Amino acid sequence: GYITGDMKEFANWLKDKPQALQFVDWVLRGISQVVFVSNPISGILILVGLLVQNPWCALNGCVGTVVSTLTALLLSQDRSAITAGLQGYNATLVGILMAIYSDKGNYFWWLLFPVSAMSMTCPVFSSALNSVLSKWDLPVFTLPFNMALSMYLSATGHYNPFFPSTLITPVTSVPNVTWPDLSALQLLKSLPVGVGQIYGCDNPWTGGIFLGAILLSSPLMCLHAAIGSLLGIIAGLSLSAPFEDIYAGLWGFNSSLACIAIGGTFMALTWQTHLLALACALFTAYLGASMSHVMAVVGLPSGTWPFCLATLLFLLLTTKNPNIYKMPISKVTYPEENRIFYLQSR
Amino acid sequence: GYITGDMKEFANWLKDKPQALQFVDWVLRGISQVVFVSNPISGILILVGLLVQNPWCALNGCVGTVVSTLTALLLSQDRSAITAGLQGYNATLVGILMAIYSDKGNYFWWLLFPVSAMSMTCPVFSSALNSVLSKWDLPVFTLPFNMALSMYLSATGHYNPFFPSTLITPVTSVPNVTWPDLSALQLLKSLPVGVGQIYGCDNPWTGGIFLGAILLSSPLMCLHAAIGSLLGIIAGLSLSAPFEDIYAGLWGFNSSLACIAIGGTFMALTWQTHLLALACALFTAYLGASMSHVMAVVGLPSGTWPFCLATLLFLLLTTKNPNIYKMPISKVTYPEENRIFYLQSR
Amino acid sequence: GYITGDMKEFANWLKDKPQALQFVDWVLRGISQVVFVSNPISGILILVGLLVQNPWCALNGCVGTVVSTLTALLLSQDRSAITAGLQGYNATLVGILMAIYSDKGNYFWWLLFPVSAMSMTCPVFSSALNSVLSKWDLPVFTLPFNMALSMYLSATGHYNPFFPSTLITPVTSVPNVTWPDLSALQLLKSLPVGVGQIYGCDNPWTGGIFLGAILLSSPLMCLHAAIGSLLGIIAGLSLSAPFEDIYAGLWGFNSSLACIAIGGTFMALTWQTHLLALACALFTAYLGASMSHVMAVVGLPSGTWPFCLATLLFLLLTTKNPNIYKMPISKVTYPEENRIFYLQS
Ligand SMILES: CCCCCCCCCCCCC/C=C\[C@@H](O)[C@H](CO)NC(=O)CCCCCCC
Ligand SMILES: CCCCCCCCCCCCC/C=C\[C@@H](O)[C@H](CO)NC(=O)CCCCCCC
Ligand SMILES: CCCCCCCCCCCCC/C=C\[C@@H](O)[C@H](CO)NC(=O)CCCCCCC
Ligand SMILES: CCCCCCCCO[C@@H]1O[C@H](CO)[C@@H](O)[C@H](O)[C@H]1O
Ligand SMILES: CCCCCCCCO[C@@H]1O[C@H](CO)[C@@H](O)[C@H](O)[C@H]1O
Ligand SMILES: CCCCCCCCO[C@@H]1O[C@H](CO)[C@@H](O)[C@H](O)[C@H]1O
Ligand SMILES: CCCCCCCCO[C@@H]1O[C@H](CO)[C@@H](O)[C@H](O)[C@H]1O
Ligand SMILES: CCCCCCCCO[C@@H]1O[C@H](CO)[C@@H](O)[C@H](O)[C@H]1O
Ligand SMILES: CCCCCCCCO[C@@H]1O[C@H](CO)[C@@H](O)[C@H](O)[C@H]1O
Ligand SMILES: CCCCCCCCO[C@@H]1O[C@H](CO)[C@@H](O)[C@H](O)[C@H]1O
Ligand SMILES: CCCCCCCCO[C@@H]1O[C@H](CO)[C@@H](O)[C@H](O)[C@H]1O
Ligand SMILES: CCCCCCCCO[C@@H]1O[C@H](CO)[C@@H](O)[C@H](O)[C@H]1O
Ligand SMILES: CCCCCCCCO[C@@H]1O[C@H](CO)[C@@H](O)[C@H](O)[C@H]1O
Ligand SMILES: OC[C@H]1O[C@@H](O)[C@H](O)[C@@H](O)[C@@H]1O
Ligand SMILES: OC[C@H]1O[C@@H](O)[C@H](O)[C@@H](O)[C@@H]1O
Ligand SMILES: OC[C@H]1O[C@@H](O)[C@H](O)[C@@H](O)[C@@H]1O
Ligand SMILES: OC[C@H]1O[C@@H](O)[C@H](O)[C@@H](O)[C@@H]1O
Ligand SMILES: OC[C@H]1O[C@@H](O)[C@H](O)[C@@H](O)[C@@H]1O
Ligand SMILES: OC[C@H]1O[C@@H](O)[C@H](O)[C@@H](O)[C@@H]1O
Ligand SMILES: OC[C@H]1O[C@@H](O)[C@H](O)[C@@H](O)[C@@H]1O
Ligand SMILES: OC[C@H]1O[C@@H](O)[C@H](O)[C@@H](O)[C@@H]1O
């Protein structure tokens, strides 16, 4: 039970100890914060998943986390945020997806320059976005990652002579979809691939491993991760998306994140907020189609912009239903503990 | 008499009456709230106009209004707002323009699935936008409609195999405009067609009906709806827009809305405030051009985004002219009643 | 010293004097407010710069400045802001860049109609944007200009029969860049050309004049203008931009504005804050490429949107370091005097 949730005991114990280990704690908590987890073991496990996918991306992820963390220290950011990993997770993503969307292949070592540079912007985006969003008691989610990646990918683009990005072009014809070819086996693989694509990973073992890491911290988060991935799959089929897009988990990652967020993490989990999480996840998946189409016209991927905009929208919803309750940000940990706080004062 | 303005007395009467009839009334107010009117008779007249245009569009509007009203109830939204029609007007438009912008033409029954889905969205957009805009005492206008429409039409796009939208492409050459051919009687028809296009109707008779539906509530609103359409035409000629576009009322619907909003509804009506409505109306017509061009690159229509942004812009204007007064949201009804509050304390 | 900084002695003296001479003053201070300077001599110097570049662009600038200042008066806007020149600078840019981005060339007199119209929007954009941004004590910078320009240029486009804009298309192939041809002298000349490009002037003399106009008001502002422009050049090189783009100052004008803003104008000037301006200026140049690439898709230029977004982004940054201090809007003048307030608060 010491390796579960928050790992609040371990961190209080670490407070006494060498700073380099304390730092490694933060980097690991930073990696896990992508899926709203603050748990170093979960972090190590996720690293394994990233290494199984592609050690090059894993490395670019780690450089990101470390560089961003150093930068928050440099700029005197809130230390409680840094120890929770809140200053590492955006750049984890920036490092990984900068490598995914690079046209130069694995171990193009120069990539480490712009990865380090874009990772330094992550605490600047976070603080600035917090100055606005904390006024409505909202989180910044991965807006810093998504701004950083959109900025970097459009600044370079596919024709940059140093750091060309992969070419992305809008849909320009009706895809032929032959429904008798739809495959149960591939759809089932799509569920964990959807969770894997939260870190831009299409290996179903990696998504399997990520589900494992979440389970360790909070089974309620694990459940909503899987359900959101499923609802994304359903949304894709409902709009007749090419099957291979659904198979590659492209319909599932934004949905999965949205479902975790609303399903107990930033809303207290009741039956009502569980239904709300199902709605948000479907909504998020459709916004993903929308953002993908539109950002393809300017040669950009959607990233997790859909998850960010969808979820902020649902958190801004007010209701006279007392069973739908927004967590105070200063109180957000994980669903099982969140629900206790809510039950105490309802 | 009792069928004028806001029908306060009929509203007070209905409160004891059957649930089903009160619901009919919320829906009809929902319909009229597109033009800032809360009047069930105006609602009936507008509905007649929609049936004169295209009964398919009328049906989708009505479904939209009903689903949204029901979703606001399901989500325990504010009753005053529901009864006033404020939870139906966005989805009225969502239904109509999803039909207007469908490439599958009339009585494509499948369209009822995404219309309902997107109508369920409108209370969530309204509530989230309120949480932000109410902090400046601003209304959401048709931002929920325009967000839903934009999301829907880019998520599907012209190449969706299930729900293709109408193809929209950017301007790629100088249009040839033959000035001698300009028809005076055609510009005169453009005025009521501009008003018809508020509900995506290009039939001049339907335009006049809407003008009449508005008249019944408020003559001042009617006058500004007409002036706004006119100014749009003038802006269109000033930029050498193709005649066919002016004639189909595409330069007049946003203008018309902006003019009504500023000309007595959201600003107290004075002559200074009347001049401000004219300026806003012109500015809106021009922002319409801008948004149309830019959104066309991604295959989207402007919708009423230009009305929403311009009017919000003009409502955030501050002045040390005491005759330019912004109405408290809580005191906004229609220009004749608004004006009494201004005379009392300004 | 009477023609230094804010020229607040002259301003007080002018108060008693004929309304029209005062007006010329506000107009001249409108011109210099593009670079956050409130100084009529600076404004005249900058005006001379514009004439050196292209008198037709100079004319459209002044017309914009006048129409906007008049519109601010008409709409009963704050007098304080009008006499400081905060109601003329956005339309100065509006006018200049509407001429630069017109496909019709010099002395196309009809251009004066939409220049005037778009200049009247500038006080409206300013007031509306203030109503939002003043809640975080943020200034509007040149968002009114950039909104008005983006609206105008996209409402017309390259294929408007009356007012075609210049055709802008996105990059569609890898540029060929010959590194042995790189010229130190041209790169050195790009520094003042970058400052020139703040008012859309590619003439290195003009940009040299602009640096002089700034220096007259504030040497610290002049220094950061030069530094901001330089870091723009480094950014361009770091992404292998075509040399001619670097040479024409296209990587330096956003950078330069950001570096002046953060380097003592909107942030108190310190060690840390200087470093922060270097960081902001680099970031801003990268955002310039991003915004130019993306906006070219819809046929629009970046204007100074990058400067506006980056600088607002860095002023929304909070820190537990007391040497990184944000100036209250009501106390902002120029670095030299801003620093006094800082040491005294
Ligand atoms: C409220 C008052 C305070 C105002 C403060 C302003 C905040 C400043 C943020 C500036 C950072 C912008 C950089 C992000 C993305 C861009 O790089 C690109 C270029 O347009 N985006 C893209 O082309 C794609 C991104 C589209 C996603 C939608 C954005 C909502
Ligand atoms: C101040 C703090 C509040 C922050 C809260 C965030 C609010 C969340 C709402 C976001 C939902 C967006 C859905 C709307 C439109 C999209 O489908 C796409 C986005 O590319 N629109 C388009 O493709 C075109 C849209 C262009 C319209 C002009 C832009 C205003
Ligand atoms: C907090 C609530 C207050 C709400 C206030 C509403 C403010 C309304 C402002 C709307 C005026 C827009 C005019 C400017 C640019 C447009 O012409 C077009 C949009 O398609 N430009 C472009 O497409 C290019 C512009 C892109 C720049 C990126 C924006 C960060
Ligand atoms: C953040 C600083 C990290 C600097 C590492 C960059 C070193 C350059 O690395 C180079 O990358 C090329 C591309 O794959 C290889 O072909 C070369 O062999 C390699 O030396
Ligand atoms: C931050 C500044 C560092 C810039 C690093 C320069 C990267 C050079 O990258 C080079 O790009 C060429 C394509 O044009 C390839 O042919 C070379 O193999 C590759 O090394
Ligand atoms: C929840 C989403 C709906 C699931 C649709 C299931 C359609 C699967 O279809 C099945 O695919 C198998 C491939 O493994 C084939 O062997 C079967 O013949 C076929 O019936
Ligand atoms: C979970 C939602 C699943 C949506 C139902 C998918 C079944 C669609 O049905 C398909 O329609 C196509 C027309 O585009 C035809 O070409 C196919 O033959 C037909 O089977
Ligand atoms: C909620 C999910 C509902 C999706 C089902 C919609 C199926 C679309 O229906 C199909 O549309 C095709 C083109 O639009 C037509 O060619 C076919 O006749 C029709 O089967
Ligand atoms: C509201 C203001 C509208 C101004 C429209 C004026 C249009 C006439 O203007 C002129 O018309 C000629 C055609 O006879 C063309 O040859 C010219 O190119 C055109 O400038
Ligand atoms: C405020 C509205 C007035 C509009 C002014 C219209 C000016 C038209 O200008 C005309 O444009 C044509 C190009 O299409 C050219 O053939 C003409 O030479 C040119 O004078
Ligand atoms: C900003 C720092 C980048 C390095 C700039 C120097 C690179 C230019 O290169 C220099 O250009 C000169 C032209 O004036 C030539 O005479 C020199 O031979 C050449 O070395
Ligand atoms: C900081 C003050 C700015 C210095 C400006 C340097 C002006 C160099 O300007 C140069 O002058 C040459 C001869 O006149 C011309 O042939 C070149 O085209 C021009 O670039
Ligand atoms: C501020 C950082 C400046 C970066 C300078 C880039 C150094 C140019 O590096 C160039 O890379 C080319 C690949 O495109 C090679 O073909 C050339 O031989 C090499 O000179
Ligand atoms: O780990 C370091 C090495 O990994 C290899 O797979 C790459 O091909 C080499 O370029 C690199 O130096
Ligand atoms: O893509 C559809 C294809 O799938 C196969 O399973 C069928 O037997 C082919 O005849 C068909 O063309
Ligand atoms: O607590 C979970 C349960 O809550 C009840 O209120 C619902 O009616 C059930 O459908 C649900 O399974
Ligand atoms: O309800 C109206 C009817 O109109 C007809 O023209 C359509 O073809 C039918 O499908 C529809 O039921
Ligand atoms: O065109 C719409 C289609 O919708 C379906 O719901 C109906 O069953 C079909 O008869 C019709 O062809
Ligand atoms: O009683 C009417 C009063 O209302 C105030 O809010 C105004 O600013 C006063 O000048 C005016 O006399
Ligand atoms: O200053 C305005 C005038 O400048 C002259 O030198 C040109 O010949 C004219 O075409 C222009 O209208
Ligand atoms: O450049 C076109 C210009 O021609 C002149 O002869 C007219 O007097 C100007 O108003 C007109 O705009």
JSON list of C-alpha atoms in Angstrom, two decimals, chain A residues 299-344:
[
{"chain": "A", "resi": 299, "resn": "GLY", "atom": "CA", "xyz": [0.18, 20.99, -41.98]},
{"chain": "A", "resi": 300, "resn": "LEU", "atom": "CA", "xyz": [-0.27, 20.46, -38.23]},
{"chain": "A", "resi": 301, "resn": "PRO", "atom": "CA", "xyz": [-1.48, 17.57, -36.12]},
{"chain": "A", "resi": 302, "resn": "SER", "atom": "CA", "xyz": [-4.19, 18.13, -33.50]},
{"chain": "A", "resi": 303, "resn": "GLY", "atom": "CA", "xyz": [-2.05, 16.83, -30.57]},
{"chain": "A", "resi": 304, "resn": "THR", "atom": "CA", "xyz": [-4.29, 16.77, -27.51]},
{"chain": "A", "resi": 305, "resn": "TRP", "atom": "CA", "xyz": [-5.86, 20.18, -28.17]},
{"chain": "A", "resi": 306, "resn": "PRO", "atom": "CA", "xyz": [-9.20, 18.34, -28.41]},
{"chain": "A", "resi": 307, "resn": "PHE", "atom": "CA", "xyz": [-8.84, 16.84, -24.95]},
{"chain": "A", "resi": 308, "resn": "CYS", "atom": "CA", "xyz": [-7.80, 20.20, -23.48]},
{"chain": "A", "resi": 309, "resn": "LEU", "atom": "CA", "xyz": [-10.62, 22.28, -25.02]},
{"chain": "A", "resi": 310, "resn": "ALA", "atom": "CA", "xyz": [-13.34, 19.65, -24.50]},
{"chain": "A", "resi": 311, "resn": "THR", "atom": "CA", "xyz": [-12.50, 19.10, -20.81]},
{"chain": "A", "resi": 312, "resn": "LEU", "atom": "CA", "xyz": [-12.12, 22.76, -19.89]},
{"chain": "A", "resi": 313, "resn": "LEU", "atom": "CA", "xyz": [-15.51, 23.29, -21.53]},
{"chain": "A", "resi": 314, "resn": "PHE", "atom": "CA", "xyz": [-17.13, 20.51, -19.42]},
{"chain": "A", "resi": 315, "resn": "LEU", "atom": "CA", "xyz": [-15.45, 21.87, -16.25]},
{"chain": "A", "resi": 316, "resn": "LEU", "atom": "CA", "xyz": [-16.98, 25.31, -16.95]},
{"chain": "A", "resi": 317, "resn": "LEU", "atom": "CA", "xyz": [-20.44, 23.78, -17.01]},
{"chain": "A", "resi": 318, "resn": "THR", "atom": "CA", "xyz": [-22.46, 24.73, -13.95]},
{"chain": "A", "resi": 319, "resn": "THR", "atom": "CA", "xyz": [-25.47, 22.81, -12.75]},
{"chain": "A", "resi": 320, "resn": "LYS", "atom": "CA", "xyz": [-28.06, 22.91, -9.98]},
{"chain": "A", "resi": 321, "resn": "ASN", "atom": "CA", "xyz": [-27.58, 19.14, -9.56]},
{"chain": "A", "resi": 322, "resn": "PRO", "atom": "CA", "xyz": [-25.67, 18.83, -6.22]},
{"chain": "A", "resi": 323, "resn": "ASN", "atom": "CA", "xyz": [-24.38, 15.38, -7.38]},
{"chain": "A", "resi": 324, "resn": "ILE", "atom": "CA", "xyz": [-22.27, 17.04, -10.10]},
{"chain": "A", "resi": 325, "resn": "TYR", "atom": "CA", "xyz": [-19.40, 18.63, -8.18]},
{"chain": "A", "resi": 326, "resn": "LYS", "atom": "CA", "xyz": [-16.21, 20.34, -9.39]},
{"chain": "A", "resi": 327, "resn": "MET", "atom": "CA", "xyz": [-13.09, 19.59, -7.32]},
{"chain": "A", "resi": 328, "resn": "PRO", "atom": "CA", "xyz": [-11.26, 22.57, -5.90]},
{"chain": "A", "resi": 329, "resn": "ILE", "atom": "CA", "xyz": [-7.87, 22.48, -7.65]},
{"chain": "A", "resi": 330, "resn": "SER", "atom": "CA", "xyz": [-5.99, 22.70, -4.33]},
{"chain": "A", "resi": 331, "resn": "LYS", "atom": "CA", "xyz": [-7.84, 19.50, -3.38]},
{"chain": "A", "resi": 332, "resn": "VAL", "atom": "CA", "xyz": [-7.34, 17.35, -6.53]},
{"chain": "A", "resi": 333, "resn": "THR", "atom": "CA", "xyz": [-5.42, 14.13, -5.95]},
{"chain": "A", "resi": 334, "resn": "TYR", "atom": "CA", "xyz": [-6.91, 10.94, -7.45]},
{"chain": "A", "resi": 335, "resn": "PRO", "atom": "CA", "xyz": [-10.57, 9.72, -7.78]},
{"chain": "A", "resi": 336, "resn": "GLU", "atom": "CA", "xyz": [-10.76, 7.44, -4.67]},
{"chain": "A", "resi": 337, "resn": "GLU", "atom": "CA", "xyz": [-9.47, 10.17, -2.33]},
{"chain": "A", "resi": 338, "resn": "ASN", "atom": "CA", "xyz": [-11.36, 12.98, -4.18]},
{"chain": "A", "resi": 339, "resn": "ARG", "atom": "CA", "xyz": [-14.68, 11.19, -3.63]},
{"chain": "A", "resi": 340, "resn": "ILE", "atom": "CA", "xyz": [-14.01, 11.03, 0.12]},
{"chain": "A", "resi": 341, "resn": "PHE", "atom": "CA", "xyz": [-13.47, 14.80, 0.30]},
{"chain": "A", "resi": 342, "resn": "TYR", "atom": "CA", "xyz": [-16.76, 15.27, -1.59]},
{"chain": "A", "resi": 343, "resn": "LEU", "atom": "CA", "xyz": [-18.81, 12.86, 0.52]},
{"chain": "A", "resi": 344, "resn": "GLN", "atom": "CA", "xyz": [-17.60, 14.56, 3.75]}
]
